[PDB]
Amino acid sequence: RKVQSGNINAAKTIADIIRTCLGPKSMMKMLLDPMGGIVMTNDGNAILREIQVQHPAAKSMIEISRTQDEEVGDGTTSVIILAGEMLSVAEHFLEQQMHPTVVISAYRKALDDMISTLKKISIPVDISDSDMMLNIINSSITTKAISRWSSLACNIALDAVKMVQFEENGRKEIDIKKYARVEKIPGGIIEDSCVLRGVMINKDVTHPRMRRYIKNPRIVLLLQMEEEYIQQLCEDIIQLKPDVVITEKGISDLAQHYLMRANITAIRRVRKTDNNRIARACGARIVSRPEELREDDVGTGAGLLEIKKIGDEYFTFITDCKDPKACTILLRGASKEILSEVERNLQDAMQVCRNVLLDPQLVPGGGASEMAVAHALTEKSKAMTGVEQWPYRAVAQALEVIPRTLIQNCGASTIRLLTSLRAKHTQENCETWGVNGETGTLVDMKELGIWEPLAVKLQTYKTAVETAVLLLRIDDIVSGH
Amino acid sequence: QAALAVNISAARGLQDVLRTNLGPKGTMKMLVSGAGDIKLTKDGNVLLHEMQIQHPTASLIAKVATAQDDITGDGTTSNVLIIGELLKQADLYISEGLHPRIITEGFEAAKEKALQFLEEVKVSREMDRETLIDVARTSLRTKVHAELADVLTEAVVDSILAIKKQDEPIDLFMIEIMEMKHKSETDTSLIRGLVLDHGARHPDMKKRVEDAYILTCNVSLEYEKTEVNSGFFYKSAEEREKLVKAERKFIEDRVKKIIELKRKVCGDSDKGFVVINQKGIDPFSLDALSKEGIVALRRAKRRNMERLTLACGGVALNSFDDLSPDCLGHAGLVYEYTLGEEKFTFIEKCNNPRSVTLLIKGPNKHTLTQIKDAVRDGLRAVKNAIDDGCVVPGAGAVEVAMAEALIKHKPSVKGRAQLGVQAFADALLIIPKVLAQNSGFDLQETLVKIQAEHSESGQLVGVDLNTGEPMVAAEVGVWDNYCVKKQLLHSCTVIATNILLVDEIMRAG
Amino acid sequence: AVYRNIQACKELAQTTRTAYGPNGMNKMVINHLEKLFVTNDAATILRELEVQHPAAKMIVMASHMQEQEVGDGTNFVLVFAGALLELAEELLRIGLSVSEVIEGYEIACRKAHEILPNLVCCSAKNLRDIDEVSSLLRTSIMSKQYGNEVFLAKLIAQACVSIFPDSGHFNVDNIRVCKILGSGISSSSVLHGMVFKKETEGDVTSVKDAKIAVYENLMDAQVKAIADTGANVVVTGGKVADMALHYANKYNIMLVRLNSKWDLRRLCKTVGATALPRLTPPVLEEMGHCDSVYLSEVGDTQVVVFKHEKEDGAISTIVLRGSTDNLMDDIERAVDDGVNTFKVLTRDKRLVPGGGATEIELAKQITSYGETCPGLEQYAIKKFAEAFEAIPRALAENSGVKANEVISKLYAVHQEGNKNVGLDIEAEVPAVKDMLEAGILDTYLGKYWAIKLATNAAVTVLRVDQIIMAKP
Ligand SMILES: Nc1ncnc2c1ncn2[C@@H]1O[C@H](COP(=O)(O)OP(=O)(O)O)[C@@H](O)[C@H]1O
Ligand SMILES: Nc1ncnc2c1ncn2[C@@H]1O[C@H](COP(=O)(O)OP(=O)(O)O)[C@@H](O)[C@H]1O
Ligand SMILES: Nc1ncnc2c1ncn2[C@@H]1O[C@H](COP(=O)(O)OP(=O)(O)O)[C@@H](O)[C@H]1O
């Protein structure tokens, strides 16, 4: 049992760090760097990322959180707290002399009940209404510098995921890494930012003889004996008379001598993902090599070709008036610090739209979703025949820590309000009577915008319980390779 | 300055110790004697007078609460709390460079301003049964476990009301406090008469007498010395028995002298007789007097004989040869009470005793001593309520109103003494801060609501322990004595003046 | 200093958590007089175990109150109190105040006093039948002398039935204990009046004299002085001389030797004969009154029996046999535990099932009350119900069965409405059985005073937060 208890204190201490780093009143932390420096951040994602830990059970908590950051850019603070609080009940592991398998079956049984309980307090959303989506996304715009342009961030965040979603395939897959490439352009301000309705390539301009502005471009996707192939591979492209030569690999110096002779734009170092968006934008086709081109490899339907030097930096705009399962964001700012604020804050809002569009269902946040769940499992434990009911009730008492931290971070009497918070869920409906993060007192969530998506909490409790299962399944540490 | 920092932090630690036993909702402290005695109590006088403290500086504060308990009888816990906070706030200015002499001048001005503030908010309500119950509730609630409140409240109130007439001042010696074991704790009630430890023990005695003439005596009815010019001279054990026949003539003949007085004064039926002799009595004298309907008691206390003179009215006698009818008394129901093991005499329903008996009942020894002090601490709280016709609201309501008067007050003597008034303002507000913690609520949130309560009228606002909202102490029946707060602010300023003026600490042996 | 007092009280629970129940363990007690003893009675452990921690002394003083108005449930004071403070840490570590817990238990203490009468399954018929006593007494003897509950349940049943007709006079002082070195329990029996082990030292087998005295030619006149005063029964404390032994036999004076001082003082308060220190003085006032003084031979051992033939008779003495003095002491406590069981039943008779049946049934109701009762005191009322569950856990651990399977099965049968279900007393069977059919019934009045004391002791501890020394 010494190894069973070692994973408790290994995770209980990690949860203690980010216990007060939750909510809009999240407390800051002081991390002493080895060079005497101090970082005064408050995000639990970056705090534990730099802190080196000695126990292996605590190192798994970091690998689990990073995978959560890719799915949803928030809520990861509670992922470790619930997994740390679930394992903090040592009365049922060692003092009661129960097996770990006894408790794993109890948590897995409680997992299926928590999932159904969160869907009972769900609510549909009308994504067609941009005003109803503004109340949802504002949960991340508050307490930020982007609050001055909240309406602009709403238009940039909500409409961008609509371009990535392809609802004809049935699954309605949304991928931010491939179809939502966010790029920056110097010059301008946050107000000057807009969403490009097409593809933008970050290729700088090397030669002066290139088509600067064309309203109907044409895109083509792909000493003696040395210049033999170079002149021929370049002469097969001008048969279609293009305006921008988009190559996958790098172009040689002599092959560019014919690209500048033609006074056409020369683009290179383009991914395979990037060319498919172009082929779907202007209807072109990706050919293996330049020598086997056909008539279909043209840019009919393209918006315009512009490689203008905007903000002392060239940018190839090949946008169009279509949404070819892709999008491109144009972030404008006077400085890099301001650009770094809008670039990262929109990624927190852009991922919230991903959860709503895949499943338009919300949940009452601010401690309301936990009490709605913990109240359902407590009454169910009195009628659950089996020894698993005891650890089944510990989950009802352990999930109360999420609202406990929000009231404790505010400084109000957490013991007085949390006990009365149970009565609101006991008598009245569980979909209301939440907790105000800023004020600290109780308030209903229908009147406030603390509503979180459904996919954020589903991955939370699935990964919070799965983390405790993986840690309680351990009983010995093996050293060797 | 270092001579003060040792004394400053000495009181701060003493503040954190005694703050958890203020009010009813606070905790208690244990007294480990080392010999086998263990005691529990919240009264700060017992935590300082009988307790031994390690620091000599804190030992001087113990003698303050000792004299404070002798004057008012309550409030010694908050006396040390204000003292610990006065030096806490004084240290904030001493770090800046202020001499302690100017700070004492600020307390002298605020002490006289706050004493004038009591004259405005004090309430001179008429003293009656309903109002004193509200006062006795305040003194006894903090000395019990939240169950003996209504039980002991009616006792202390009716006890003092029985011994107060013709505008006579109050005296604590007019109440005989007795204790009884082998019973529960909630059986504490009032006894109109006087309870005697030892009583008559013979089968031929009456179980109860509706009316009996009590004869007071001090005569020895056991084997005594020879009363004539003779002595005890014998040669064997049988010859010694002949001297018993001679010496007992001084004891046996005095038993019949009581019988002659019985047939003389009301010797008919429907009457009785009770002898309350302080000395011991022989069984032959018990059997001789038991058959005659005469109840003979022995082994009484010196003070019980003094109260017995008042109960019946018979004057104390010293010899039965000087017996007369003038020294005969009269009382109502005279019987014997039965406990699990022992039995006691009861002479209730007296004519004009002018002396009541508060009979305490409890099962344990250490719990009986807790109620022993609560009686003396409860009787004295209402004692000052009637002797001092004016009272003040409780619930810490005087402290929050006092902070409004002193902040809105400028010294007309000098400027730099104004900061001493600022320290005396935050020092008085520690009581609503202490009780907010003993109640389990937030310390500062309770202070905001009671301080934020304002209106265009005379508004008395206090602390609610059950909910934590502003409580009008006059509406709920929460009151104190006028001499308590007057002695509080008059005492706490003198001690803070004596300690802060200590410049150096020399080891004098 | 609250966490240190709680942890100190848990140290005392483990010294009596395992000695509780029929499958309970014994404890290797070593007397202060350099003597070895082995027993499982919790009252005897604390008498020798000097509890010096003041925090736990309140629990011991609560057990002293368990002597008055009841003679059972001492382990309830030690186990139920330890479980309340053990779970009290779970509330304080959350942030709850100590005062809200004190007022929370006083609410649950009253709530349990209202639910307990509803669980009274049966009551004593008070028919003064031997089968009535022995059938109901099967619960109190076990866990004190286990395995020998058959003979003991019938012996004491014969002593109590003799006293119930004398209504208002039944007490533990009427049923005394007298044990003799012998084979075992098979030779134990019950007799009336006062019975001692030392046989008649003299030659008198029977004498109907009234006066009893308690304490070469000269000594022959002094023994005649006992006869001149009208007394033919002499009781010497210490050894008796050889010449004084025969002088009593000449005038037919019954000689009796009582070495143990408990045998001497027992006669002072029954017949009235008090022990005089001088060498047989002629004092008639200090002599006693007895109807018949005769010698009886029961169990192959002569015993002096003081039968009050003329009086109604209310003095009972159980004659015990056993080869081991240590083992007979364990029977001495079970006899006093059974006599005190029915001493409470002289009042209004109410019987509840034992074996953790009421402790889950009482917790199932208070827990449902705590869920519907809002306020800041519900956290303390909940743990007051979960604190009752530790008493089943005490029996499950001593029975060698996993306590987790016990609480689940006790909750499942009561969930379906099957009341009167307790623990199955068997190591190979983690199931349960009906307590009514098995004959396991505790005393209602004992639990009313036991839950009252265990809550007041736990509140008395939680009210204290610091220990400070002093000097008068
Ligand atoms: N305005 C608010 N009022 C009350 N609670 C809030 C509010 N905003 C966020 N919270 C709570 O703070 C928790 C953490 O939110 P967030 O910061 O988005 O995730 P993380 O802390 O993991 O970065 C959520 O579970 C939510 O219930
Ligand atoms: N339940 C309560 N709520 C608010 N204030 C109280 C309460 N009980 C007592 N007090 C206040 O605490 C002060 C001290 O009361 P008491 O305990 O009688 O004296 P001490 O604390 O010196 O023993 C009183 O002035 C009274 O106003
Ligand atoms: N046969 C039994 N089955 C289950 N529990 C028992 C049995 N006998 C005694 N007990 C329990 O053990 C605890 C101690 O019993 P007992 O010896 O009668 O009282 P005490 O230990 O106070 O003298 C009691 O609470 C009782 O319920």
Q: Tell me the CB-side half-sphere exposure of residue A34, using CA atoms within 13 A.
A: 3
Closest to B175 (Cα-Cα) out of B339, B474, B365, B375: B375
Range of the domain at B166: 126-192+354-389
- Burial of residue C64, with CB atoms counted within 10 A of its CB: 0-12 exposed, 13-18 middle, 19 or more buried: middle
Kindly report the CATH class assigned to C124-192+314-349.
alpha beta
Which pair of structure tokens corresponds to residue A481? 């390779």
Q: Calculate the CA B254 to chain-centre distance.
A: 42
DSSP annotation string for A301-330: T---EE--BTTSSB-EE---SS--S-EEEE
| Sequence letter at residue A385 | T
Ligand 1 centroid – CA A469 distance (Å): 25
CB burial string C404-415: b at 16+ within 10 A, e below: bebbbbbbbbbe
Number of structural domains found in chain B: 3
Chain A and chain B share a number of CB contacts under 8 A equal to 8
Q: What does the DSSP 8-state code read for residue C178? A: E
Cα C84 to Cα C104: distance, rounded to the nearest angstrom: 12
Residue B76 designated active-site = yes
Does residue B351 contact residue B125 with C-beta atoms inside 8 Å? Answer: no
Cα–Cα distance between C164 and C314 in angstroms, integer? 9
Distance from CA of A383 to the nearest CA of C (A): 7
Spatial CA neighbour of C279 closest among C242, C234, C249: C234
Number of C-beta neighbours around residue A203 at 10 A = 18
Active site residues of A: 43, 76-77, 348
Beta strands at C464-469 and B28-32: parallel, antiparallel or unpaired: parallel
DSSP C274: P
Cβ neighbours, 10 Å, residue C433: 16
Angle at CA of residue C376, ends A89 and B75, nearest 5°:
115
Query: Which residue has tokens 């300023």?
Result: B493
The reported resolution of this PDB entry, expressed in Å, is 4.1
Task: Count how many Cα atoms sit within 13 Å of the Cα of residue A446 in the half-sphere of its side chain.
Answer: 9
Please, are residues B219 and B258 in contact by the beta-carbon 8 Å criterion? no
CA-to-CA distance for C5 and C2, rounded, in angstroms? 5
Reduced to 3 states (helix: H, G, I; strand: E, B; else coil), residue A155 is: helix
CB distance A322 to A126 below 8 Å = no
Angle at which helices A454-472 and A76-86 pack, to 10 degrees? 40
Among the listed residues B178, B482, B189, the one whose alpha carbon sits nearest the alpha carbon of residue B303: B178
Distance CA C251, CA C272 (A): 23
Residue C341 CA: nearest ligand 3 atom is: 18
Whole-number Cα distances in Å, A228 to A254, A256, A267, A268: 11, 14, 22, 21
CATH node for C193-313: 3.50.7.10
Of B52, B324, B332, whose CA–CA distance to B209 is shortest?
A: B332
**Three-class DSSP category at A75:** coil
Q: What is the CA radius of gyration of chain A?
A: 28
For residue A348, give the H/E element and its range.
helix A336-358
- Residues of A with CB below 8 A from B468's CB? 416
| Cα–Cα distance measured from residue B79 to residue B81, given in angstroms and rounded to the nearest whole number | 5
CA-based nearest residue to A459, from A372, A298, A317, A351:
A351
**Residues B145, B364: contact at Cβ < 8 Å?**
no
Instruction: Please give the torsion angle defined by the CA atoms of residues A141, A146, A151 and A154, in that order, rounded to the nearest 10 degrees.
Output: -60
Tell me, yes or no, whether B176 and B258 share the same domain: no
The answer to whether B2 is a known ligand-binding residue is no
- CB distance A426–C408 less than 8 Å? no
Q: Is the CB of C395 under 6 A from ligand 3?
A: yes
DSSP for residue A288: S
What stretches of B29-75 show up as alpha helix (H) in DSSP?
Answer: 44-49, 56-71
In angstroms, how far is the first alpha carbon of chain C from the final one?
24
d(CA C130, CA A213): 117
Other residues' Cβ atoms within 10 Å of the Cβ of residue C129? 12
Sheet holding B28-32, edge to edge: B38-41, B28-32, C464-469
Q: Which long-range contacts (CB under 8 A, 24 or more apart) does A129-136 make?
A: A130/A154, A130/A155, A130/A158, A133/A158, A133/A353, A133/A356, A135/A449, A135/A451, A136/A352, A136/A356, A136/A362, A136/A449, A136/A451, A136/A453
Q: Which two tokens stand for residue B315?
A: 């004057």
**Closest C-alpha among B396, B344, B374 to residue B139:** B374
Residue that is written with structure tokens 């927190």 in the block: A348
Backbone angles phi, psi at C69, to 5 degrees: 70, 0
Consult the annotation and say whether C20 binds a ligand. Answer: yes
Go through C67-95 and write b for each residue having 16 or more CB atoms within 10 A of its CB, e for each that does not: eeebbbbbbbbbbbbbbbbbbbeebeebe
Q: How far, CA to CA in Å, does B428 sit from each of A9, A281, B425, B434?
A: 45, 78, 6, 11
Q: Which residues pair with C256 in a beta bridge?
A: C235
- Residue type at B424? F
**End position of a domain, from candidates B362, B389, B416:** B389
Q: Give backbone dihedrals phi and psi of C213, rounded to 5 degrees, phi first.
A: -110, 140
d(CA A27, CA A42): 6
* Residue C333 Cα distances to A424, B269, C41, angstroms: 54, 55, 8
Is the Cβ–Cβ distance between B178 and B357 less than 8 Å? yes
Interchain contact, B445 vs A416, CB within 8 Å: no
Side chain identity, residue C261: K
The span from the CA of A251 to the CA of A254, in Å, is: 8
Residue showing tokens 């802060």: B500
Domain assignment of residue A276, given as a range:
199-330
Report the CATH number that the domain containing residue A235 is assigned in CATH: 3.50.7.10
Both B397 and B359 in one domain: the answer is no
Cα separation, A353 vs A369, in Å, equals 20
The three-point CA angle B422-B428-B431 to 5° equals 145
Does any CB of chain A come closer than 8 Å to the CB of residue C277?
Answer: no
Question: Residue C442: in which H helix or E strand, if any?
Answer: strand C441-443
Chain A residues whose C-beta sits inside 8 Å of any chain B C-beta:
412-413, 415-416
Q: In chain C, where are the structural domains located?
A: 2-123+350-469, 124-192+314-349, 193-313
For residue C461 and ligand 3, the question of a CB distance below 6 A is answered with: no
Question: CA-CA distance, B357 to B301, in Å (whole number)?
Answer: 15
Query: Could you give the 3-state DSSP secondary structure of residue B431?
Result: helix
> What tokens does A112 get?
């299926």
Q: Are C311 and C169 in contact (CB under 8 A)?
A: no
Q: How far is B95 from chain A (nearest CA, A)?
A: 29
Q: Quick one: which ligand is closest to C438's CA?
A: 3
- Integer Cα distance of C65 and C71 in angstroms: 10
Antiparallel, parallel or unpaired: β C27-30 and C36-39: antiparallel
Q: Show the CA angle centred on residue A270, arms to residues A264 and A273, nearest 5°.
A: 130
Q: Which helix (H) or strand (E) holds B242?
A: helix B237-247
- Between CA C33 and CA C14 the distance in angstroms is 25
Instruction: Report the distance separating Cα B55 and Cα B64, nearest Å.
Output: 15
Find the farthest-apart pair of alpha carbons in chain B and give their distance in angstroms, rounded: 99
What CA–CA distance (Å, rounded) separates A349 from A362?
15
Q: How far is the CA of B479 from the centre of ligand 2 (A)?
A: 10
User: Cα–chain-centroid distance for residue C131?
Assistant: 21
Ligand 1 pocket (Cβ < 6 Å) reads: A 22-24, 74-78, 139, 365-366, 402, 406, 436-437, 450
CA pair distance C98, C462, nearest whole angstrom: 7
DSSP one-letter string for C191-209:
EESEEESS--SSS-SEE--
Residue A18 and residue A31: Cα distance in Å, rounded? 13
| In contact, A8 and A80? CB cutoff 8 Å | no
Residue C306, helix vs strand vs coil: strand
Whether residue B367 sits in one domain with residue B349: no
Is the Cα dihedral B263, B265, B268, B269 positive or negative? negative
Residue B47 makes CB contacts below 8 A (sequence gap 6+) with B18, B21, B29, B31, B41, C468
Which residues contact residue C221 at a Cβ distance below 8 angstroms, ignoring those fewer than 6 apart? none
Instruction: Indicate the helix (H) or strand (E) that contains A246.
Output: strand A244-246
Helix axes A336-358, A130-141, angle to 10 degrees: 130
The answer to whether C288 is a known ligand-binding residue is no
Amino acid identity, position A466: E
Helix (H) or strand (E) holding A273: helix A272-281
Give the Cα separation of A457 and A462 in Å (integer).
8
Place of tokens 């004092």: C283
Chains that touch A (3 or more CB pairs under 8 A): B, C
CATH code assigned at B40? 1.10.560.10
The span from the CA of C234 to the CA of C223, in Å, is 9
Residue A364, SS3?
strand
- CB atoms under 10 Å from CB of A61, counted, come to 21
**After which residues is chain C discontinuous, taking C to N > 2.5 Å?**
215
| Contact predicate C20/C398, CB 8 Å | yes
- For B120, half-sphere exposure in the C-beta direction (CA atoms, 13 angstrom radius) is 12
CA–CA gap between residue B78 and residue B15 (Å, rounded): 9
Task: State the Cα–Cα distance between residues A91 and B348, nearest whole angstrom.
Answer: 61
Determine the residue of chain A that is closest to C401 in CA distance.
A97
B215 to each of B282, B297, B477, how far by Cα in Å? Answer: 18, 11, 47
Which residues are bridge partners to A358 per DSSP? none
**Pairing between strand B294-296 and B273-275?**
parallel
Phi, psi dihedral angles at B275 (to 5 degrees): -100, 130
**B478 and B431 belong to one structural domain:** yes
Q: In angstroms, how far apart are the furthest CA atoms of chain C?
A: 90
Active site residue B43: yes
- The domain defined by C2-123+350-469 folds into GROEL; domain 1 (1.10.560)
For residue B289, give the amino acid letter.
L
CA dihedral sign of residues B420, B425, B426, B429 = positive
Nearest to A149 by CA among A110, A189, A119, A111: A189
